[PDB]
CSV table of C-alpha atoms in Angstrom, one decimal:
chain,number,residue,atom,x,y,z
T,1,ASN,CA,128.5,113.1,77.9
T,2,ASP,CA,127.4,109.6,78.7
T,3,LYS,CA,124.0,110.9,79.6
T,4,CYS,CA,122.6,110.3,76.1
T,5,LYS,CA,123.0,106.5,76.4
T,6,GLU,CA,121.7,106.6,79.9
T,7,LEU,CA,118.7,108.8,79.3
T,8,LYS,CA,117.5,107.0,76.1
T,9,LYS,CA,117.7,103.7,78.1
T,10,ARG,CA,115.9,105.2,81.1
T,11,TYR,CA,113.3,106.6,78.8
T,12,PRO,CA,113.2,104.0,76.1
T,13,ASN,CA,110.0,105.1,74.4
T,14,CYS,CA,110.9,108.7,74.8
T,15,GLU,CA,112.8,110.9,72.5
T,16,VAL,CA,116.0,112.1,74.0
T,17,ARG,CA,117.3,114.9,71.8
T,18,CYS,CA,121.0,114.7,72.3
T,19,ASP,CA,122.9,117.8,71.2
T,20,UNK,CA,126.4,117.7,72.6
T,21,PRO,CA,125.9,118.1,76.4
T,22,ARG,CA,122.3,119.2,75.8
T,23,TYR,CA,119.8,116.4,76.5
T,24,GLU,CA,116.2,117.2,76.1
T,25,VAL,CA,113.9,114.2,76.6
T,26,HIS,CA,110.3,114.2,75.3
T,27,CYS,CA,108.0,111.8,76.9
């Protein structure tokens, strides 16, 4: 999904673990 490129930009200092459609962001 395009969410990985969105989320890691929304949370730029956070770690967005992108696994397929699984997106787990650590802030």
